Design a protein around this ligand. Sequence first.
Ligand SMILES: Cc1ncc(COP(=O)(O)O)c(CN[C@H]2[C@H](O)[C@H](O)[C@@H](OP(=O)(O)OP(=O)(O)OC[C@H]3O[C@@H](n4cnc5c(=O)[nH]c(N)nc54)[C@H](O)[C@@H]3O)O[C@@H]2C)c1O
Ligand SMILES: Cc1ncc(COP(=O)(O)O)c(CN[C@H]2[C@H](O)[C@H](O)[C@@H](OP(=O)(O)OP(=O)(O)OC[C@H]3O[C@@H](n4cnc5c(=O)[nH]c(N)nc54)[C@H](O)[C@@H]3O)O[C@@H]2C)c1O
Ligand code: NA
Ligand code: NA
Ligand code: NA
Ligand code: NA
Ligand code: NA
Ligand code: NA
Ligand code: NA
Ligand code: NA
Lengths: 386, 388
Amino acid sequence: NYPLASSTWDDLEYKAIQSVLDSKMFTMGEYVKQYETQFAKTFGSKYAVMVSSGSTANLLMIAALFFTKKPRLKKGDEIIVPAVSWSTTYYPLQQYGLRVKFVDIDINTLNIDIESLKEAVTDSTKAILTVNLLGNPNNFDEINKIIGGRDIILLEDNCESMGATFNNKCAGTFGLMGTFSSFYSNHIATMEGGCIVTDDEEIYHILLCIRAHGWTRNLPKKNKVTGVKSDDQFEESFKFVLPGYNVRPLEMSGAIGIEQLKKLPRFISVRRKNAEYFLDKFKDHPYLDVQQETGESSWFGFSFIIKKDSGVIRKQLVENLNSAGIECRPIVTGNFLKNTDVLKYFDYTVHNNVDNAEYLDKNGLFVGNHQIELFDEIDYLREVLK
Amino acid sequence: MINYPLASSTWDDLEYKAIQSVLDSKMFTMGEYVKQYETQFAKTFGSKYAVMVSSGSTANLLMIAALFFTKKPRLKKGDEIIVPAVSWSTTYYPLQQYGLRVKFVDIDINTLNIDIESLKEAVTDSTKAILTVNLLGNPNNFDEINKIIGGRDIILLEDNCESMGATFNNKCAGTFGLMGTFSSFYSNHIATMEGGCIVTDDEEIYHILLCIRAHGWTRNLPKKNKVTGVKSDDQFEESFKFVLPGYNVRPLEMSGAIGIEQLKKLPRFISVRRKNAEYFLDKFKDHPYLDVQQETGESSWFGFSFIIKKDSGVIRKQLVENLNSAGIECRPIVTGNFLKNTDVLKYFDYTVHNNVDNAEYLDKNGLFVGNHQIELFDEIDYLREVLK
Ligand SMILES: Cc1ncc(COP(=O)(O)O)c(CN[C@H]2[C@H](O)[C@H](O)[C@@H](OP(=O)(O)OP(=O)(O)OC[C@H]3O[C@@H](n4cnc5c(=O)[nH]c(N)nc54)[C@H](O)[C@@H]3O)O[C@@H]2C)c1O
Ligand SMILES: Cc1ncc(COP(=O)(O)O)c(CN[C@H]2[C@H](O)[C@H](O)[C@@H](OP(=O)(O)OP(=O)(O)OC[C@H]3O[C@@H](n4cnc5c(=O)[nH]c(N)nc54)[C@H](O)[C@@H]3O)O[C@@H]2C)c1O
Ligand code: NA
Ligand code: NA
Ligand code: NA
Ligand code: NA
Ligand code: NA
Ligand code: NA
Ligand code: NA
Ligand code: NA
């Protein structure tokens, strides 16, 4: 009845898949490059690199910084992150030996708490990995003011807020790099898929290398990684130059992605009409608070946070919703800091406390938003949550 | 002249029918076809378990990572792992990515695999693992290798991405190790667009693999599992429960469907490839200036290597030009001597055992041409006329 996701595909995605089958060219190639070109143009970045998933997009975004001619990050360098996000926003950090400093969320926007950040940022701060949660962008004016002239790298995990904007600028393009996901239930879907955008040429070339075996095939002749490639094909076929991975996306995902990008403006439009209806329906709810919008959110889903002293218990809310046929979820990692076990592998610290994340973990959950009008489902959702 | 490219399509109507079936279903994310494929995969090779992943590179990544995650961790940073000097780039990276101390050992110029004698010399009390690689279809001699280990605490891993279908002593390559990796890239034994697989007989490793393949969550773990012991019944609780630092390297449902079809054809593909190898060997056996690969067990012959004989006055670049002129696609023998890679090596904590002169000689004098699952008699005659 009210599922988290639905299909974003029509006949065009199916015909694109058919074009690839017809071409018999399956390995990352022409459609992926065209998709990358369109993607960068769509969100306003100079360059885009498509990868296997938004999670390998995050992996290369962190890895890239160790491989610049002059490394931008090194083991033990401190990186600041919000206490609530997806697991693979944090794993790469652990995988590359960074010192993770968690900062609390603001219970209203669900994004990193700006006042807490202002205090967490010190001279030891090397990067801030922001997360635009559930479609809602971070106020980049405030964040950039905090950074100021400091040598702190801004990064964005934008896997939940494709299409979101702040001051007419697309989320994902504020950081030195920004990542996106095109998994099934996201704003666009390419079966699986992710993308890294950047305007930095060295970074872009490093990404081209580390995505595909750390080889030079995808680098241009004149490039920041190897300088100038040899004109001899045998010489540049298996030439390995950086410790990377094979995280190439498939030509089908690229082909499908191109059609999705064309539908994106309408998807965001509908998703925002859904949010308007929803917020109007929930504006003055007796016991539930909704996400507070920054810039223009792309509304990935609709969160609820049980109001304090409402007496309301989350467990029951969930039953009710489920019992009513309404799919729901926790708000992603909820408080990631509760993963004591996995945290055993990290080099980390917590700035101040993550009191809001804790409250969220126990009092929040989310229901779906889609690229199709959901007025009936929202009406029902409000009734069920009488 | 003649068209003799490195690889050709291994698909027929059946692979397209499989894709159609996924399309009709509307379920694209890793599911039932992948599950089925893993079941068939394990059976095909004789392992208890199989875990399909996005590529043979991500299969190697998970193979190494899992060893850090067992309840009693089987490896830790700085631990010593020995690997041959020649293989694929992604055989090496995960090693550096997990902060291991890599010990390089020369290859045998005949088999193209790790030099046994050198391996025997290299194994010390500090040796924690041996990451064997069955090159170009050729399995390692696991008897000799196991003798060397001699009931000592050294884990054996195999990177079997180039030797699907090889056997040694009636045992399938990939199954000698605690773990074994395979690739299903286009130019490989079977092809699922991109694809990899890790096989093991270890239930803990199997579960660790299932967790780290997908977000480090518990979704794909059974209620009772070696990672979290016992799952909660409350799904809201197990919805997004994160327990091991993993990745998202899931394969696509289409890849699993295609793969099932591919596994049925494999035996025939191996048959054709070996008959091609027979003709090739008969044709190049007394070549005046080129050595071929010496077979161990029953090779699956991924491709046909050549190494210019010392003192021949023959130059690789020439043969390369010659081959291309003829329309014969060729490649260096994979990484060649990986030790030349100062650019990548600067990020490693490694050492070299003795020397890698053979790997060096191969690096300057070696190359390979293709083998396919379709007869290549004319193409081989042609190749023999070109390399005259
Ligand atoms: C020891 C070891 N360990 C791990 C790995 C990594 O496995 P993985 O590649 O991550 O799955 C490997 C991988 N080795 C493979 C890698 O898979 C590598 O990508 C592959 O290199 P390649 O043969 O030079 O890749 P290629 O130039 O893309 O494909 C060779 C020919 O096939 C053609 N081709 C590739 N894909 C397609 C396709 O989809 N359609 C058509 N028509 N032709 C295709 C290309 O045009 C070439 O003519 O061969 C290497 C030896 C390995 O050797
Ligand atoms: C901050 C952040 N950073 C990084 C990432 C990683 O990106 P990525 O997932 O690696 O691309 C993410 C990823 N977030 C997503 C991930 O995409 C994650 O996998 C997802 O969890 P999920 O919504 O529970 O994914 P699911 O339960 O497997 O599928 C969602 C619904 O859609 C349905 N569905 C999924 N795939 C298909 C399909 O192929 N066909 C059909 N018909 N239905 C499908 C399922 O039945 C579910 O009801 O939602 C999370 C919020 C992120 O949030
Ligand atoms: Na949704
Ligand atoms: Na700080
Ligand atoms: Na930008
Ligand atoms: Na959507
Ligand atoms: Na081949
Ligand atoms: Na075995
Ligand atoms: Na190199
Ligand atoms: Na013929």
